[PDB]
């Protein structure tokens, strides 16, 4: 509930059944932590007439928006203050029968920058220990020709020019 976005709720009993209505059925089987029990969708569902009663009585009802065939299926709330007035609260989508609350673009930024800042701070605090400074030595970590080659060189050249390598 506090961090329900990371929780994954699965149930292999209803995996073989997967169609347009089976998404709503699997989401609303019983006692789903993601699916509120006191929702108004129940009131429409148990008796009959699952067509229009969502917009009639006051409540937050569940309707699909985008449905791609194999796995992904999106579930949308509408809080019904008045008919033809759509306001959503939370976002849901299932992938391979695994329900997920769709995060915002803000809290994911929060989590990634938290991880990045923690990693960089850890690396910096670990790197602090290696340097030692002294005003005389500086910084550190814990862990000739006698000008006669202007002749001997010539002799060598006279030697090389007269004795080529034999390889």
């Amino acid at each position: 509930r506090d961090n329900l976005l990371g929780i994954s709720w699965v149930d292999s009993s209803w995996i073989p059944i997967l169609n347009s209505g089976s998404v709503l059925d699997y989401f609303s089987e019983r006692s789903n932590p993601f699916y509120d029990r006191t929702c108004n969708n129940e009131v429409v569902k148990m008796q009959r007439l699952t067509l229009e009663h969502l917009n009639q009585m006051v409540g937050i009802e569940y309707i699909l928006l985008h449905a791609q065939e194999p796995i992904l299926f999106i579930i949308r709330k509408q809080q019904r203050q008045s008919p033809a007035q759509v306001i959503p609260l939370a976002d849901y989508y299932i992938i391979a029968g695994v329900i997920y609350q769709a995060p915002d673009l803000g809290s994911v930024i929060n989590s990634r920058v938290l991880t990045a800042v923690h990693g960089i701070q850890s690396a910096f605090d670990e790197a602090m220990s290696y340097c030692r400074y002294h005003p005389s030595k500086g910084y550190w970590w814990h862990f000739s020709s006698i000008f006669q080659r202007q002749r001997v060189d010539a002799l060598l050249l006279d030697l090389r020019q007269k004795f080529p390598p034999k390889f």
Partner: protein
């Protein structure tokens, strides 16, 4: 020449002084405690701890640079000081 070296010493001194003063002013800039908004509390807390750590490191580096400048001035004056050299010679 000699004007370039001395003006380089002046540049180093003024740069380090303004750097340490600016660093302390920015430390007090982030020192105002206020109310948050869309900033993800733990993230900026950790990275402001990080910033004050690196700024304290900058302060230490500034002190070490001043020490190096003092040593260089000490070397310079003794070597080229005509008056000091003469006194030793006459004694």
């Amino acid at each position: 020449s000699k004007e370039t070296l001395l003006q380089s010493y002046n540049k180093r001194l003024k740069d380090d002084i303004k750097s340490i003063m600016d660093n302390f002013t920015e430390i007090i800039k982030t020192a105002k405690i206020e109310d948050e908004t869309q900033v993800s509390r733990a993230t900026q807390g950790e990275q402001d701890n990080y910033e004050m750590h690196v700024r304290a490191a900058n302060i230490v580096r500034a002190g070490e640079s001043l020490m190096k400048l003092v040593s260089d001035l000490k070397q310079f004056l003794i070597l080229n000081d005509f008056p000091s050299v003469n006194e030793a010679i006459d004694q």
